[model samples]
Target: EDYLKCLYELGTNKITNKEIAQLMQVMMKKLLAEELLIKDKKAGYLLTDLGLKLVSDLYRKHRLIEVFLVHHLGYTTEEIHEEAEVLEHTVSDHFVERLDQLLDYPKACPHGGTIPAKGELLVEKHKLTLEEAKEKGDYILARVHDNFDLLTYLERNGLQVGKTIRFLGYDDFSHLYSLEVDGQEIQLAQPIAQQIYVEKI
Candidate 1:
């Protein structure tokens, strides 16, 4: 299932040797023989025409797990990938389909990723890096890239995805920022601001 997901997320069926850096070069034939993937002489593996049909559900399963973890469990974006890895393979198809119905088939997962109807990465929101946000209007935070001190900083400041915030500008010398979330002001550093992506509203 994980292998299917790696190929699906590649967006291009062709998975180059370099792209699968952790993958063993020796096992290419086994994967090919198993019909899980086919060879592309261009230097990598491309999905067999049928491979797309086989893996689509696993992708949706992964995305839905992300939604459940984020929306109900208060999981971090980085954490969801780790959490979903094993769970996607373990959950029943019936459960996944039922959960989709319960979640109302959310168009986007918690981190602003799409839930994917047939699974084409349903996300279609225009999110800007905080460093690129120049307008003073309120923007909704959609996703956070990592769980670092910046995340801790945001947590301490009571800022998170789905928080509505306004750009209060930045310090030119240090490239740090001042943004307002709720009624409180936040001072975010350059690197941290760069990692945060907010929905354009």
Candidate 2:
């Protein structure tokens, strides 16, 4: 379950064995043994149908828990990851339904990741990374890589999902991305920009 959850977060169902090993340091043999994942010689490890279902269910519980933690208990985005992780495994399906009700059916988690609805696989959105956004393009911040440290960095800069950020330009020499969010000019390093996903307005 943990491996499948991490694989779902990595944004692709199919990934190289080397990438998986580096990601969670897992023994692929176990996943293969259970038939949760299958190794494709060309595309790497792919999740089986069963794996996707489990991940989808777990993600629903996980994201809804994060929403509950933030809206009810007042946890910061940085605090919700591990907190939600623990609760997700223990909570009952009926408990999740009640929590989701209390959350007013939140569509996304604190990090702007879409919560998979019950029995539904997550669908990928066609989006450009902030690095790929064109200069002066009208765009909205859609999602972010859900890493606590990275969230902390973004929070410190007053940047988060749903902000309208206009790409001004990139400075190749300094490896920086110039942007404007809500009329405020800011600059981010290339690495930081790459983690942000954006959609054109």
Candidate 3:
């Protein structure tokens, strides 16, 4: 589960086996075996076909459990991951099937990660990083990666997903973005904006 979760977090970035081992320790505790086969190590840790299927199924189950726990039972988001983690170990397959029917088989978790399917691979959107957008053509804000600080900041301002912004120009160092949103002009620091993804209109 940890490995699958990390892969989902990191996207397609190359993750070393050492990194996987470290994350496993943090998330899975003693559940992961520490067998060090050099050849297998060099190949890097990946979910085999069967392993991927298992993780994907479990991933879906975990998220639905979270949704049910939070939306229906009034558990907090932070409370859900830990509770779901424990339940993932012992929940009956029959219960998961029933839960799937209960939740209508959600396609994504609350955090926006894909729920795995038999032959479906997760397709990432082709979007410009805010920094890349500054250098490219005029674009519109689409989705903001979900982070507490960033989401709070975006919400505090009028800037948010689906807000249309016209890129005016940048600073001498190209570290700031001058933009027009909803007829109001604003300047966003490049570093902060770079975390946002956009698409050209």
Best by TM-score: 2
Please provide, for model 3 over 1-201, each residue's C-alpha lDDT reduced to its tens digit, 9 standing for 90 to 100: 445656545543355756766756633322234321112343444444544455556666666676677667887544654576788667887787787678787765544445555344444353466666545346767656545567667766677666677778777786677877778777788667777767788
TM-score of 3: 0.53
Query: For residues 1-201, what per-residue lDDT tens digits would candidate 2 score against the true structure?
Result: 577777656643457656767877655688788888787776566788878888878767877887788878998775685576777678899999888888888888866777877888866353478887765677788888777877888888888888777878888798889888768888898879888888887
Higher-scoring candidate on lDDT, 1 or 3: 1
- Give the Cα-based TM-score of candidate 2 against the true structure: 0.83
- Candidate 2: clashing pairs of residues: none
Instruction: Give the per-residue lDDT of model 1 (tens digit) for 41-116.
Output: 7636676645665665555776787787778888874576466678877889888889898888887665455455
Q: Residue 55 lDDT in model 1?
A: 65
All candidates' TM-scores?
A: 0.58, 0.83, 0.53
Error of 3 at 52 (Å): 6.8
Global lDDT of each candidate: 0.69, 0.77, 0.61
Instruction: Superpose all Cα atoms of candidate 2 onto the true structure and report the RMSD in Å to 1 decimal.
Output: 2.7
Model 1: residues with Cα > 4 Å off, grouped in runs: 1-59, 69-84, 92-94, 146-153
Name the top lDDT candidate.
Answer: 2
Q: Rank the candidates by TM-score, best first.
A: 2, 1, 3
| Model 2 segments more than 4 A misplaced | 11-14, 124-126, 172-174
